[PDB]
From a paper:
Here, we present the 2.8-Å cryo-EM structure of homomeric human [name] ([name]) channels that for the first time shows NTs resolved at a local resolution of 3.0–3.2 Å. The [name] protein was heterologously overexpressed in HEK293S GnTI− cells and purified at high NaCl concentration (≥300 mM, see STAR Methods). The cryo-EM density map of [name] achieved an overall resolution of 2.8 Å with imposed C3 symmetry. The final model was built for residues M1–W411 of the pore domain, with the exception of disordered residues F69–D91 in EL1 and residues V177–G230 of the intracellular loop IL1. Concordant with an accessibility analysis, the NTs, resolved at 3.0- to 3.2-Å resolution, locate at the inner surface of the pore domain and span nearly the entire width of the membrane. However, the NT (M1–L20) of [name] channels can be partitioned into four subsegments, which we named NTa (loop, M1–P3), NTb (310 helix, V4–F10), NTc (loop, A11–Q14), and NTd (310 helix, P15–L20). In the present structure with resolved NTs, the permeation path is partitioned into a neck and a base. The neck, with an average diameter of approximately 11.2 Å, is lined by residues of the N-halves of the NTs and by residues of the extracellular halves of TM1. The narrowest portion of the neck is situated at residues M1, P3, and T5, where it displays diameters of about 10.3, 10.3, and 10.2 Å, respectively. Although the narrowest portion of the neck is wide enough for the passage of hydrated halide anions (∼7.0 Å), it is narrower than the size (11.0–13.0 Å) required for the experimentally determined passage of larger anions and molecules in native VRACs. This suggests that the pore may be in a partially closed state and undergoes further dilation when channels are fully opened.
Volume-regulated anion channels (VRACs) are hexamers of [name] proteins that are crucial for cell volume regulation. An [name] subunit consists of an amino terminus (NT), four transmembrane helices, and a carboxyterminal LRR (leucine-rich repeat) domain. Recent cryo-EM studies of [name], LRRC8D, and [name]/C channels reveal a hexameric assembly of [name] subunits around the central axis of symmetry that defines the ion conduction pore. [name] channels can be activated by low ionic strength and cell swelling.
Author numbering:
A (entry chain F), B (entry chain E): 1 to 68, 92 to 176, 231 to 539
């Protein structure tokens, strides 16, 4: 007999955690609220009317009532207070404890269920991890960069800066969490406790629910006080208590079935590992590693909520997207005046630029229309963009340990507008295959072994 | 007997979803609150007074009361507690279950109705979709471009990029949801469940409501306890319960009528597919496709709220709108006149403009009446507009990897006012087929391989 809204304290989380609640958690929260309602109703029902009316049996045979002008009433010669005394005594002694304390057992079981549901949200060690993960997930879902990505079928420096900051935050969080294995373990334990709690409530309640009967029969051995051997009592609340007990059993059965579904869902597919196979297969972004424990599980929960969050979060775990972002913001801070002052006119009166150890080629490079020599040193995974057609005066290109991809327009421009090529390489992988389709080259300079085992000079057959 | 604020846990949803509640959902929510109110009232009424005053009948005929100095009272020789006992016994055994458990049945039915109404708001797999859809819908309704468009009959950078971002968010959301089918199916299932629940409730309640009588007659066979065979009872709460049951019947009838209207509205017109036919007539946007399942459904739902939402949202579904947005942002960021400073008189003493790698042709181009040479480089999906007829002095057009389409007026202008054409192409798709219908051409320049395997010079047969 304590209002639901004050018992609700046990069952309430942040609205932020709404993402972390799969459908089974939501269903069990609803069912727990209903269980709490019937616990409160039964408790008030008992407290305000716990009556038990008892009448003595004048003819008693074998500790049992013999059950045998106009009719006249039977006279027992008992005070109202003697009737009250025998009611209290037979309600205390010869009434089954289940019919007495059922609405309190219901409340206690419901509170244990609520505590099991919300423990991992209240426990600080996992509450911190969940709130950190949900904040990161919401920021990734909010970031404009995740909109630009996945859309491949010039950007602002400030947003392009906070996007790299989000990459760093994701990396730090992943490093900090991916070794924990505490959220998964705690969730395992909570579900197991819920299942073995349901599997006990069902047995004991079904076993004892037959003891809630309306017509109780008591023999309390108080002959000195009232003068009657045995009494025939009547527990008026018994029918409504059976109804509430049966309704509670139905609710507990549903709760246990849902918890068994959750337990089975966790016993299969090994939630400690996360695949990301679908995204890397439908976006060609294969560079998304399998996520280890305590981070695979938290992603599996969001998949139960919305696969969209996982998809929009995978973009912040791929190295390809990181490279794209670093190229994109390399262009943001690179103006053209900072590029102009950095340029050098060399000994042959040719304007040159020398770059080394960057993540790629800034696109702002190719607006420096006076440039005549381009040098690229130790830059990985380069692709030549079409804007190279703007460098009408280019004569030399130096590729030092830099493999380069290219498509046809830029290729044609280079076929028609190049005089020299320098290459410094370790092996064949740093030799672009397209060089032999060129036609205006006047100098070629190769630094490295041109031969392989049993394949002498295959590199230069063309 | 739980106050209706605790029950209001089941009966509420976040106001973000007023857009998704048609008038029938609003009416059923109101009716459900009223039914909950009468359930609570009946529950407290029963708990505080579930009395059944019973008096014995001294003259009994055919298991019924014969009902046949100054007047004096009838002496029954029963203690107060024997009266209590027979009240309890006749209330348990000889009072109809409907008259006892009517308010609890009302509470159970109302809870089931509320659950069936809010399930699709609580179910994460559809709750996520509805939240996503409504957020996109509100952003589209409030976005400045939605009123910049539809009015056709120096722009903020932030606004200009968020409009583009909103276009892509609409595209991604449409792709993610349009193959769903789940929201509509689950809504239909909820409505069907409500309709069968109404059909069952009205049946059983009408069939049994006649059993709530005031004067009950009980024969419970307790002579060993009271000495009286049959009793004439009286359920003081019977008339109030009858009027409460009739009020509940009225509410259930209204609820069922509304739910059958919803079922009918869902059954006809094939809500799995939208039209946009009305919108695309008053907008001159024939490029707005029919919308498939799970997206047509929420469009239909919003139309039940305000058709303006769907109208202001349909702009982000037409390719023409995206093209116009890109043209407008392009012309804004590359100002009308900055172009004049950008022009160049070339080596052949012809005034030229060189453009590259844009999304289309800025309309500001065709105010540059001094032009003689136009260069277009790597621009997709170009259609030449009629305003090219303004450029009376045009003598050269260079299309470098820029496919172009055209209609007859601009085409005739170019037929009559062109001397040379240069084309740089990857394959035939970048060759405009109309060139052979030209008449005033003096130079043709093709850059690219004109031949394919076993198909020499088919490209140039014309
Ligand atoms: C609404 C929130 C309810 C809050 C309850 C408040 C107090 C109620 C009674 C107290 C019981 C609560 C559980 C206490 C268990 C110890 C918690 C604690 O702080 O220890 C820290 C532990 C230690 O980490 P570990 O060594 O890596 O894991 C092995 C672990 N010893 C094991 O169980 O192997 O780190 C852990 O890993 C935690 C151990 C696992 C505990 C799992 C319990 C799940 C549900 C428990 C809720 C209580 C249910 C009944 C209470 C309801 C009462 C009406
Ligand atoms: C306030 C919200 C109340 C929340 C309920 C809390 C728990 C109360 C009792 C639980 C009953 C819930 C209804 C069943 C939902 C089960 C969800 C579940 O287990 O799997 C999720 C299912 C997956 O199925 P599917 O892939 O779409 O195809 C099969 C499909 N079901 C079919 O019929 O082929 O996805 C689905 O498709 C869902 C099935 C659609 C059925 C629509 C049910 C609407 C009314 C249900 C409300 C409960 C009413 C009674 C509760 C009141 C108790 C007082
Ligand atoms: C927290 C609040 C929620 C708490 C509770 C919600 C549930 C409320 C109880 C509703 C069931 C009433 C009932 O017991 O029906 C029985 C009567 O027989 C009895 O058991 C009652 C009479 C007692 C005398 C001995 C028998 C059987 O009657 P029926 O007509 O055969 O079937 C009833 C089902 N029907 C409605 C589908 C027809
Ligand atoms: C949750 C709270 C909401 C719960 C409930 C809201 C509804 C409240 C009940 C109002 C109706 C009272 C009533 O029963 O009227 C009848 C009296 O006759 C009776 O039935 C009562 C007397 C019982 C004795 C046997 C008859 C008929 O009286 P009338 O004057 O012929 O007509 C009444 C209608 N009028 C007001 C339009 C005139
Ligand atoms: C959820 C599905 C399975 C419906 C659940 C209904 C079952 C589990 C509940 C509802 C009513 C309950 C019964 C109500 C009363 C009695 C009579 C008693 O002498 C033995 C237990 C017994 C028989 C209960 C057993 C469990 C019961 C049958
Ligand atoms: C679906 C969920 C929410 C409710 C399930 C309905 C069940 C649990 C409810 C509704 C009808 C109820 C039963 C109707 C008939 C009786 C007769 C009564 O003398 C003993 C209890 C018993 C057996 C009730 C027990 C509880 C009961 C079975
Ligand atoms: C606003 C609407 C929905 C209220 C519903 C009005 C009707 C359904 C309610 C209001 C007044 C009620 C009636 C008042 C008169 C009587 C006579 C009484 O001896 C039996 C109940 C009965 C027959 C009631 C039945 C239900 C009743 C007719
Ligand atoms: C909103 C509209 C549908 C109101 C409809 C009113 C009708 C359908 C409802 C309202 C009150 C109801 C009546 C209330 C009182 C009685 C008297 C009882 O001995 C038999 C049932 C009976 C006859 C009910 C039958 C249905 C009833 C007449």
């Amino acid at each position: 007999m304590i209002p639901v809204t004050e018992l609700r304290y046990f069952a309430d989380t942040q609205p932020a955690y709404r993402i972390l609640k799969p459908w089974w958690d939501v269903f069990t929260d609803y069912i727990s609220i209903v269980m709490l309602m019937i616990a409160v109703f039964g408790g008030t029902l008992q407290v305000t009317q716990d009556k038990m009316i008892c009448l003595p049996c004048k003819w008693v045979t074998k500790d049992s009532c013999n059950d045998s002008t106009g009719p006249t009433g039977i006279k027992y010669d008992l005070d109202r207070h003697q009737y009250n005394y025998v009611d209290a005594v037979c309600y205390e002694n010869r009434l089954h404890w289940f019919a007495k304390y059922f609405p309190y057992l219901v409340l206690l079981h419901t509170l244990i269920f609520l505590a099991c549901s919300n423990f991992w949200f209240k426990f600080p060690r996992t509450s911190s991890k969940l709130e950190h993960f949900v904040s990161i997930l919401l920021k990734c879902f909010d970031s404009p960069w995740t909109t630009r990505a996945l859309s491949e079928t010039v950007l602002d420096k400030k947003e392009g800066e906070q996007a790299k900051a989000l990459f760093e935050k994701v990396k730090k969080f992943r490093t900090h969490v991916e070794e924990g294995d505490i959220v998964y373990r705690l969730y395992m334990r909570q579900t197991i406790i819920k299942v073995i709690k349901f599997i006990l409530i069902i047995c004991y309640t079904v076993y004892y629910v037959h003891n809630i009967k309306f017509d109780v029969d008591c023999t309390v051995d108080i002959e000195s006080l009232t003068g009657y051997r045995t009494y025939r009592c009547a527990h008026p609340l018994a029918t409504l208590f059976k109804i509430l007990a049966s309704f509670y059993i139905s609710l507990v059965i549903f709760y246990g079935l849902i918890c068994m579904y959750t337990l089975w869902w966790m016993l299969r597919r090994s939630l400690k590992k996360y695949s990301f196979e679908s995204i890397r297969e439908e976006s060609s972004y294969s560079d998304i590693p399998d996520v280890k424990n305590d981070f695979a599980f938290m992603l599996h929960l969001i998949d139960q909520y919305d696969p969209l969050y996982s998809k929009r979060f995978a973009v912040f775990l791929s190295e390809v997207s990181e490279n794209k972002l670093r190229q994109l913001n390399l262009n943001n801070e690179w103006t053209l005046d900072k590029l102009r002052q950095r340029l050098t006119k060399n000994a042959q009166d040719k304007l040159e630029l020398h770059l080394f150890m960057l993540s790629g080629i800034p696109d702002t490079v190719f607006d420096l229309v006076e440039l005549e020599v381009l040098k690229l040193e130790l830059i990985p995974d380069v692709t030549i963009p079409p804007s190279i057609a703007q460098l009408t005066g280019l004569k030399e290109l130096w590729l030092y340990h830099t493999a380069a991809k290219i498509e046809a327009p830029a290729l044609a421009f280079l076929r028609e507008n190049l005089r020299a090529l320098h290459i410094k390489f370790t092996d064949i992988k740093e030799i672009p295959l397209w060089i032999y389709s060129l036609k205006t080259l006047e100098e070629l300079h190769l630094t490295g072994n041109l031969s392989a085992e049993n394949n002498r000079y295959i590199v230069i057959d063309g």
